[PDB]
Enzyme design. Structure first.
Site, PDB file in Angstrom:
ATOM      1  N   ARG A 282      62.487 -69.362   4.385  1.00 28.78           N
ATOM      2  CA  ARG A 282      61.441 -70.081   5.105  1.00 28.78           C
ATOM      3  C   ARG A 282      60.949 -69.281   6.305  1.00 28.78           C
ATOM      4  NH1 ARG A 282      61.924 -74.361   9.320  1.00 28.78           N
ATOM      5  NH2 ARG A 282      59.887 -75.400   9.436  1.00 28.78           N
TER       6      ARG A 282
ATOM      7  N   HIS B  54      57.113 -68.237   6.986  1.00 29.20           N
ATOM      8  CA  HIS B  54      56.390 -68.684   8.173  1.00 29.20           C
ATOM      9  C   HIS B  54      55.866 -67.516   9.001  1.00 29.20           C
ATOM     10  CE1 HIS B  54      56.996 -73.196   8.812  1.00 29.20           C
ATOM     11  NE2 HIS B  54      57.344 -72.953   7.562  1.00 29.20           N
TER      12      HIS B  54
ATOM     13  N   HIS C 254      61.045 -74.143  -2.904  1.00 33.27           N
ATOM     14  CA  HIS C 254      61.567 -75.402  -2.392  1.00 33.27           C
ATOM     15  C   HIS C 254      62.756 -75.915  -3.190  1.00 33.27           C
ATOM     16  CE1 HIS C 254      57.895 -76.851   0.178  1.00 33.27           C
ATOM     17  NE2 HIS C 254      58.681 -76.008   0.822  1.00 33.27           N
TER      18      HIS C 254
ATOM     19  N   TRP D 255      65.328 -81.156  -2.142  1.00 30.08           N
ATOM     20  CA  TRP D 255      64.518 -81.244  -3.350  1.00 30.08           C
ATOM     21  C   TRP D 255      65.357 -81.304  -4.620  1.00 30.08           C
ATOM     22  CZ3 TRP D 255      63.193 -78.178   0.826  1.00 30.08           C
ATOM     23  CH2 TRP D 255      61.948 -78.422   1.418  1.00 30.08           C
TER      24      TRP D 255
HETATM   25  C1  HEM Z   1      51.725 -75.937   1.661  1.00 32.42           C
HETATM   26  C2  HEM Z   1      52.850 -75.214   1.616  1.00 32.42           C
HETATM   27  C3  HEM Z   1      54.198 -75.617   2.274  1.00 32.42           C
HETATM   28  C4  HEM Z   1      54.506 -76.680   3.041  1.00 32.42           C
HETATM   29  C5  HEM Z   1      53.587 -77.831   3.510  1.00 32.42           C
HETATM   30  C6  HEM Z   1      55.910 -76.585   3.394  1.00 32.42           C
HETATM   31  C7  HEM Z   1      56.616 -77.477   4.173  1.00 32.42           C
HETATM   32  C8  HEM Z   1      57.973 -77.446   4.418  1.00 32.42           C
HETATM   33  C9  HEM Z   1      58.698 -78.343   5.292  1.00 32.42           C
HETATM   34  C10 HEM Z   1      58.077 -79.497   6.107  1.00 32.42           C
HETATM   35  C11 HEM Z   1      59.990 -78.003   5.270  1.00 32.42           C
HETATM   36  C12 HEM Z   1      61.102 -78.717   6.074  1.00 32.42           C
HETATM   37  C13 HEM Z   1      61.848 -77.743   6.981  1.00 32.42           C
HETATM   38  C14 HEM Z   1      62.881 -78.497   7.775  1.00 32.42           C
HETATM   39  O1  HEM Z   1      62.699 -79.725   7.984  1.00 32.42           O
HETATM   40  O2  HEM Z   1      63.883 -77.869   8.204  1.00 32.42           O
HETATM   41  C15 HEM Z   1      60.139 -76.865   4.377  1.00 32.42           C
HETATM   42  C16 HEM Z   1      61.309 -76.201   4.062  1.00 32.42           C
HETATM   43  C17 HEM Z   1      61.422 -75.047   3.315  1.00 32.42           C
HETATM   44  N1  HEM Z   1      60.369 -74.316   2.795  1.00 32.42           N
HETATM   45 FE1  HEM Z   1      58.410 -74.949   2.699  1.00 32.42          FE
HETATM   46  N2  HEM Z   1      56.424 -75.444   2.815  1.00 32.42           N
HETATM   47  C18 HEM Z   1      55.404 -74.826   2.121  1.00 32.42           C
HETATM   48  C19 HEM Z   1      55.515 -73.654   1.404  1.00 32.42           C
HETATM   49  C20 HEM Z   1      56.659 -72.898   1.256  1.00 32.42           C
HETATM   50  C21 HEM Z   1      56.719 -71.547   0.738  1.00 32.42           C
HETATM   51  C22 HEM Z   1      55.468 -70.763   0.278  1.00 32.42           C
HETATM   52  C23 HEM Z   1      58.007 -71.153   0.754  1.00 32.42           C
HETATM   53  C24 HEM Z   1      58.643 -69.809   0.307  1.00 32.42           C
HETATM   54  C25 HEM Z   1      57.990 -68.818  -0.310  1.00 32.42           C
HETATM   55  C26 HEM Z   1      58.795 -72.255   1.277  1.00 32.42           C
HETATM   56  C27 HEM Z   1      60.164 -72.264   1.452  1.00 32.42           C
HETATM   57  C28 HEM Z   1      60.892 -73.233   2.113  1.00 32.42           C
HETATM   58  C29 HEM Z   1      62.336 -73.301   2.216  1.00 32.42           C
HETATM   59  C30 HEM Z   1      63.333 -72.293   1.605  1.00 32.42           C
HETATM   60  C31 HEM Z   1      62.655 -74.380   2.937  1.00 32.42           C
HETATM   61  C32 HEM Z   1      64.091 -74.833   3.290  1.00 32.42           C
HETATM   62  C33 HEM Z   1      64.351 -74.607   4.777  1.00 32.42           C
HETATM   63  C34 HEM Z   1      65.775 -74.954   5.127  1.00 32.42           C
HETATM   64  O3  HEM Z   1      66.519 -75.430   4.232  1.00 32.42           O
HETATM   65  O4  HEM Z   1      66.169 -74.752   6.305  1.00 32.42           O
HETATM   66  N3  HEM Z   1      57.941 -73.298   1.573  1.00 32.42           N
HETATM   67  N4  HEM Z   1      58.885 -76.560   3.875  1.00 32.42           N
HETATM   68  O1  LIG Z   2      56.552 -74.102   5.434  1.00 34.23           O
HETATM   69  O2  LIG Z   2      55.484 -74.548   6.309  1.00 34.23           O
END
Ligand code: HEM
Ligand SMILES: [O-][O-]
Length: 295
Positions: free
Chosen positions: A49, A53, A176, A192
């Site tokens: 993530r 970002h 995700h 997820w």
């Molecule tokens: C419109 C696109 C996206 C949205 C709205 C989004 C939104 C989010 C949100 C709100 C979280 C919660 C983080 C937390 O509460 O700690 C999250 C987690 C995460 N996202 Fe996304 N994301 C998007 C695209 C992506 C992409 C493109 C990737 C990787 C290529 C990704 C990988 C991850 C991962 C690995 C987590 C887990 C973070 C953790 O476990 O600490 N996401 N995302």
């Molecule tokens: O992941 O915004």
């Protein structure tokens, strides 16, 4: 005239594949050791993530943002409400940056994501060096990262700014399958899927096999929860509400290899958006995992 700025990549002085492989190993060895983070999920997902970002801020119209400058180290991007929780990934990479001070911030941030994906049984991701730290005045303003409370029309139009098409968007969203949403970080709670630290096409299998229902969480936000305990952001669930997105979702859920290859290309493209690679620049590196090295 606001002509697109050009971020020419410059390989760190006197560094080759073996130098960056040692950085990969230092990151990978720390992943298996600090395995108690976030209920023993590990630092894997937060590093993926992080790399997304620090790359998702890119704007293809004026070539601002991106992973080149490594501007996440500055307070404005560090304190992005969208980047809440990424401080854990930054502190994870601090002892590694002190061990390898020659590597740039952008290179370390992006290589951390490549390492985490590969060390979690994911596909090989070609990675390239050359990112150069830029001054603090180059830090992009907050708000460039997407909102999770949106629909498929927003997801498609947002990722157009990152030069990403539908198939490429569905591929990246498959990341995700890792980690979870933290209510203290983003107003959403729950993972997820079941395999939190194993890179799989499970994100697509749960989107089609689970019975999802729109519910409201403790942060007053609305999300799609299933009876198995999984959740999906509104942007995640919009991948099956949109007919064009849905056909790609079913394609990845049926073929893990097709998903791995498409993600590997889209993730590298994400990490390389906005960087001009000269003709004298070396070829992309394919880093050996710890298992392939016997470490
Ligand atoms: C419109 C696109 C996206 C949205 C709205 C989004 C939104 C989010 C949100 C709100 C979280 C919660 C983080 C937390 O509460 O700690 C999250 C987690 C995460 N996202 Fe996304 N994301 C998007 C695209 C992506 C992409 C493109 C990737 C990787 C290529 C990704 C990988 C991850 C991962 C690995 C987590 C887990 C973070 C953790 O476990 O600490 N996401 N995302
Ligand atoms: O992941 O915004």
């Amino acid at each position: 005239i606001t002509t697109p700025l050009v971020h020419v990549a410059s390989v760190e002085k006197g560094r080759s594949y073996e130098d960056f492989q040692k950085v990969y190993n230092a990151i990978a060895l720390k992943l298996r050791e600090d395995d108690e983070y976030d209920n023993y999920i590990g630092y894997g997902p937060v590093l993926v993530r992080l790399a997304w970002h620090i790359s998702g801020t890119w704007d293809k119209h004026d070539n601002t943002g991106g992973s080149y400058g490594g501007t996440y180290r500055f307070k404005k991007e560090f304190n992005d409400p969208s980047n809440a929780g990424l401080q854990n990934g930054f502190k994870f990479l601090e002892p590694i940056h002190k061990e390898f001070p020659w590597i740039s911030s952008g290179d370390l941030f992006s290589l951390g994501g490549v390492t985490a994906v590969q060390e979690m049984q994911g596909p090989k991701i070609p990675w390239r060096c050359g990112r150069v730290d830029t001054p603090e005045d180059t830090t992009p303003d907050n708000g460039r990262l997407p909102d999770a409370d949106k629909d498929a029309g927003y997801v498609r139009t947002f990722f157009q700014r990152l030069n990403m098409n539908d198939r490429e968007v569905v591929a990246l969203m498959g990341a995700h399958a890792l980690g979870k949403t933290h209510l203290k970080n983003s107003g959403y709670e729950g993972p997820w899927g079941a395999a939190n630290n194993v890179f799989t096409n499970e994100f697509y299998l749960n989107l089609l096999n689970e019975d999802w229902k729109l519910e409201k969480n403790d942060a007053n936000n609305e999300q799609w929860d299933s009876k198995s305990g999984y959740m999906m952001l509104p942007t995640d669930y919009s991948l099956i509400q949109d007919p064009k997105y849905l056909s790609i979702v079913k394609e990845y859920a049926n073929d893990q290899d097709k998903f791995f290859k498409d993600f590997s290309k889209a993730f590298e493209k994400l990490l390389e958006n906005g960087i001009t690679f000269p003709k004298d620049a070396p070829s992309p590196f394919i880093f050996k995992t710890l298992e392939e090295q016997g470490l």
